[model samples]
Target: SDIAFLIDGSGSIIPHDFRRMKEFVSTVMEQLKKSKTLFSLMQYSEEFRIHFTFKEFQNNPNPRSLVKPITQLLGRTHTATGIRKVVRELFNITNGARKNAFKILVVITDGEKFGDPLGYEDVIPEADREGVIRYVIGVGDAFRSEKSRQELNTIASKPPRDHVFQVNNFEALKTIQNQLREKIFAIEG
Candidate 1:
């Protein structure tokens, strides 16, 4: 199984949070030593910054991998449209073509859509039904918007099995990180 970190790299995220984002992702390469598990990353604001794909991450575990590359991008919060697009790409590549491995998609955002359109509503279900395990982690107080959270909740698979979670601040990154690690390793076995 592969754990994909989809992060919000928009300007609204504090600089400290951005640094934490880099740390959280780089920590993944170390946690899954042997670097056996692939570590792909995506940073979205207006467009998708697909740092690398599953195959690529498996081949490259250096500090130069896509996850660590977050150390360099500049961004701002915006519509989740780009994120929706990138996920659709992953769904096609993973389930439709490379039907040999399990896939997990982890979306981390501050949770405010500048637009009212439901981007996730359309793509999330498409990905979920095709064997994708989707998890949403809302970061910071900005994500407290009921409208955004409501739309996110709707995309969740079913009752008691929500794809949504909220982290009050970026400081909660480590906790979220641990949760992801345990979940992914458990799945691996």
Candidate 2:
């Protein structure tokens, strides 16, 4: 399986919270390593930063190697743009994405998007057309707004009940670690 994480690096997220996100990624990586799963990550705010690629981690395969660079990008949340970019560019052959691999895109965000908010809605079909299974994680007040919750629902894979998650905050991400792992493992089987 080829799994890629799209993490929010907007100004709304603090340094401490970002660290917790990294910790969560590291924890998930340990679970995936057992399966020899290919992993990649991108952090986005106003721009998309490729934190690491599947090729780099395939060579090293240590999730911890991604932590030091997980610092804040601190700009507007251009989430819709980020997704489109990933679907269009990052998942291509030149980016080391295997053609026949089971593709998974895990989007971890606060659910508050600025700049081209409507643009994200269009990418859902593109992801579907590309055969990408998506998991959407909402953190820190995401459920507080019905609009945010709805957006999350729309962005996740079909039967959103199984693919969407709400975390109280970054610290609480651990609560869903096992569930997330099992979800991935279930599909692997």
Candidate 3:
């Protein structure tokens, strides 16, 4: 299967949290090294671009190379339109796996949208139907604030907090890496 990593380069994330994002992503790459996985990287702000295309880790084990490319993309927050665009692009490219393999979109963001015009609920399910497993992890109190917490519940069917993962400030990036490492080992079926 192919797994695409959509990372947030938004302003809501703190400086320390940003570093944590780097570390967390490094760990994710480490985990991928151990699996027969194909991966891609995308960083979104007002616009989204593919930092790296889906390819074998053996071909490009150094995901840090992607970090610099992503850093060049200027964006202050997560743009919902950008997300929608990327998801749609992925859907179009994947086609039907059929006898091959499935595709998954693993999104790591604080979920604070400065420009989520399509709305999370609307776009997520559509992406889900396209065979993308949407996993949202919220970093710090920002994502868990009163307004967002309730809205997230209605967007995710797996229960209010179940689909919504809350990681503390600065600590979020590290925590999510650990959580994701475990997820990689477990079989979805």
Candidate 4:
């Protein structure tokens, strides 16, 4: 399988939580290594940056190093921008995404978006057309609202129960790590 992590580095997430995000991603790197999977990562807020590409993961020998330098992108929660870019750029052949492998997107965010140029309508369909399976993790209580819950649903692939995870706080990320790992493995099964 090929997985791409789209992380929200928006200001809603304090630096502490941002570090927790990296910690969670680091664990995935180890699992991907174990499963012989390929993974890439991108972080975004109003602005965005790639932490590594699928091609870079092949060179890293040590995947953790790719995550070590990731500081927060820090701005508004422009999630659609990240989603659009990830699907348009990283999932394509030029970025080393294998055509024969399953494409998965794991999106980690604090909750609702802010000042987004593209709505879910504009970009999610493109991801659907690309055959990308998506999982959405909404951190913090902001997702306690119906509006927030729908946003998560909209971003995830169908059968949202299997793909949308809403945690009470960033500190709880570790608690759900294995669950996330299991879901990915189950998807491949």
Q: Highest TM-score among the candidates is held by which one?
A: 4
Give the worst 10-residue stretch by lDDT in candidate 1. Answer: 71-80
lDDT of 4 at 177: 87
CA deviation > 4 Å runs, candidate 2: none
- Comparing candidate 1 with candidate 4, which one achieves the higher lDDT? 4
What does the lDDT come to for candidate 4?
0.86
Root-mean-square deviation of every model: 3.3, 1.5, 3.4, 1.3
lDDT of 3 by residue, 11-127 (tens): 665565667776677667767554556666777866677666654333666767655444534465554565576566644444222224455555566656665556766676666
- Residue pairs in collision within model 2: none
Clashing pairs in 1: 10-75, 10-76, 11-75, 11-76
What is the lDDT of every predicted structure here?
A: 0.64, 0.84, 0.59, 0.86
Q: Is candidate 2 or candidate 4 better by lDDT?
A: 4
Best by lDDT: 4
* Model 3 misplaced regions, further than 4 Å: 14-16, 56-59, 72-79, 91-99, 151-162
lDDT digits (tens) for residues 1-189 of candidate 2: 888899999888888888999899988978866555788888888878987787777777788876666678888778888888778776877778898888888999975778766576688889889999999999988567767788888888989999999988889999999999999988777
Residues 1-189 of candidate 4 have per-residue lDDT tens digits of: 778999888877888878888988988768756545889899888888988888878887466788889888778888988899999899989999998889989999886878787888899999998999999999998899978799999999889888999899989988878888888887666
Kindly list the per-residue Cα lDDT of model 1 for residues 94-140, writing each as its tens digit: 52325666677677777566653556666666666667676677777
